[PDB]
Write a sequence for this structure.
């Protein structure tokens, strides 16, 4: 029969951290997952996993290659994977060598004038690509920032209907300290006294159906704000958090899946699967 | 289960041409296949189809783009396809936009000094790639020349264990007129009095297992001839023909699947799926 949470998830292996949400969704931490059981189950379902990534402007030279090279080596090893790359200058797209079960597909996109819109417009573009082709090509999809690098296996244990990432700096913080959009005028507004976690927009996924809804609702909020002459504090991330507050994710990833070494390396982070690239806004951004 | 030939192949539709061999293999002509029945069959088995193509030197600028643009449009439509592109200079590789169910993988290869060796080395390289990864990615694979363009649907009706292509200029000729290698000193030698058809090396395919044997055996003959100071009249094509004589293909494609318009367009050619590019050796080749 079907896959059951206990088949692959054992929360008691990590008693010192949050492994379950009040809506019964698991928070995946190193040690709680049985990847062997899942690689088997999914192999028999012959699944294919997609991964979208954008690189506009200097983000191409600065991060695209490192991102893809690491993704090839660590993302969903043992299963067919398709990398969907969106850049503004395809002549700069690095055609590095891919390994077994990896393939790519590159798309030329318009570069928005403000880096903020470059970051936010991703929600619209992803939705279009899901409708146009991704829904027909994969069973699950992850959408990620390019300014990060895979450090270890990021596999099937991360798959789910809708998947969210716990932002590294706030996983232990109280919701009322979260950097949610606090202005009622914004569609991303979340009042004090509300919120479960602070999700990182650098990583999110799920089935194409769920990701389409996530990206569609987020872009609708982004456009609504533009009509009301307001822009969320943390752009599409603020909208993503509003979305995940209303539509609880079926799976959350621990900070081990998107860690910022600037924090150092505390006891809770047992095995880092991905790490943030140091910020270099002075050079990679050309406005604000 | 159990796909039977009559399920999709009806020879009586083309009574004026050879539609069946003496060893039970069908010769696919326009009108004889039921692609609808096959598409449904293969869709249920969730097959993926691979296509390899080499472009070394000026063949890249002259033919790679056109080849890929046409393949994207007509090759195995409705099914997952992976294009494996082998070039010697990835920077000149045209990265065209691909449509639904199409994805790429590019590899940098060494350019052999003689065009004859570039053409023949393909047999070795394909074999290496099948073992390293293609055998784990596709159910069927086609290996094609780059100096041609898809003109119409080239689909599932072409799939089989081992697939051979009839050369457009000799499909009606007698075996003794075929341009086989007639020197007994060559591993590709075929005596007068023998032979079924003259196969084109511009197109051949089958399951990864079969293509691995086709390629490995041809290359062995190629290396042997080098040890005996002889080079087949039509290079790897001569060896391919010797191979298909000993190991009969389970399916053959009519000239409609690889036609040369310089012959003109006779009544037998009902619907062209692929056409030869005009030869331009003076520019694309650097040695006699
Ligand atoms: C505690 C604290 O203030 N920590 C900040 C981090 O939050 C910050 O990361 C940024 O966080 C915002 C959300 O608040 C968003 O996720 C950004 O994309 C992310 O980069 C970090 C940045 O260097 O500095 C810490 O001091
Ligand atoms: C009748 C005749 O000689 N026709 C030739 C074609 O055969 C020839 O095509 C070449 O054929 C050889 C095998 O004989 C091999 O397949 C080559 O790759 C192929 O290009 C054609 C070439 O322009 O000229 C005709 O006159
Ligand atoms: O000028 C830009 C701005 C953004 N991005 C994309 O948008 C993501 C989010 O922006 P950024 O990473 O800079 O935000 P941060 O995490 O730093 O907050 C990046 O990873 C890129 O993929 C880009 O390519 N070029
Ligand atoms: O210098 C060369 C010679 C050959 N090829 C490859 O080998 C195939 C066979 O060579 P060619 O087409 O020129 O042979 P022909 O059909 O003309 O006889 C080509 O389509 C290319 O894919 C190449 O890329 N560069
Ligand atoms: Mn980022
Ligand atoms: Mn050719």
């Amino acid at each position: 029969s079907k896959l059951k949470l206990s088949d692959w998830f054992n929360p008691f292996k990590r008693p010192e951290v949050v492994t379950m949400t009040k809506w019964k969704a698991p928070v995946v931490w190193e040690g709680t997952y049985n990847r062997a059981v899942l690689d088997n189950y999914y192999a028999k379902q012959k699944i294919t996993v997609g991964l979208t990534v954008f690189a506009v402007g200097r983000y191409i030279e600065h991060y695209l290659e490192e991102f893809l090279t690491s993704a090839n080596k660590h993302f969903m090893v043992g299963h067919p994977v398709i990398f969907y790359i969106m850049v503004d200058d395809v002549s700069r797209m690095p055609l590095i060598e891919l390994g077994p079960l990896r393939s790519f597909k590159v798309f030329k996109i318009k570069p928005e004038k403000r880096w903020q819109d470059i970051s936010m417009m991703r929600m619209k573009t992803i939705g279009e690509h899901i409708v146009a082709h991704i829904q027909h090509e994969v069973d699950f999809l992850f959408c990620m920032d390019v300014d990060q690098v895979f450090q270890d296996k990021f596999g099937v244990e991360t798959l789910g209907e809708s998947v969210a990432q716990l932002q590294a700096w706030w996983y232990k913080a109280d919701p009322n300290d979260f950097t949610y959009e606090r202005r009622k005028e914004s569609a991303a507004y979340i009042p004090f006294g509300e919120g479960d976690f602070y999700y990182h927009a650098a990583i999110f996924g799920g089935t194409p159906t769920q990701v389409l809804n996530i990206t569609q609702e987020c872009f609708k909020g982004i456009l609504k704000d533009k009509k009301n002459d307001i822009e969320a504090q943390w752009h599409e991330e603020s909208h993503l958090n509003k979305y995940f507050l209303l539509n609880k994710p079926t799976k959350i990833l621990s900070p081990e899946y998107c860690w910022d070494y600037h924090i150092g390396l505390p006891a809770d982070i047992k095995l880092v699967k991905m790490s943030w690239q140091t910020k270099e806004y002075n050079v990679v951004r050309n406005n604000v």
In short: The helical segments of chain B are 5-8, 35-44, 59-74, 115-137, 208-227, 236-246, 281-284.
